[PDB]
């Protein structure tokens, strides 16, 4: 269900993960990250948005794609997001290569 409207919201329409975590991209990740955003997420605590480590066990890889390449969308349109929205407030432009990298990180926090 939340995967399907992410996708038709976009732009990321479907993520094939590896079995196994990609080492390298993940640490790209953790780079960019620690540039873009610890602005406003920690991955234990709440911050300006919600805490991060167990993103991916909650959502799925479409949703997290498109909340970093399409926020406006994202909040307009799909039903968990509209929700954080009435509860964080309201307050990047990435690459499609940048947030999969950044996905990569997420996947390999909830690892640990
Ligand atoms: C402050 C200016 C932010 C920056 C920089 C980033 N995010 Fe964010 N994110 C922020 C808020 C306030 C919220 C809640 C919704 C709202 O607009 O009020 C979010 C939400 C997310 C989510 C959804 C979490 C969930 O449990 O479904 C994700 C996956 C997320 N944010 C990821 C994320 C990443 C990876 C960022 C760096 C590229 C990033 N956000 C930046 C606020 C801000």
Sequence with gaps: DPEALAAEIG???QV??????????AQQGEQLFNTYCTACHRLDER???????DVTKRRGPVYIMNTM??????????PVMKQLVQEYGTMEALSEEQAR??????????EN
């Design 69 to 78: 390449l399409n926020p406006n969308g994202m909040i307009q349109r799909h």
């Design 11 to 13: 732009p990321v329409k």
């Design 47 to 53: 911050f300006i948005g919600p805490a991060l480590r």
């Design 101 to 110: 990298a950044i996905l990569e990180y997420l996947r390999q926090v909830a």
């Design 16 to 25: 094939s993960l590896g079995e196994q975590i990609d080492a390298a991209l």
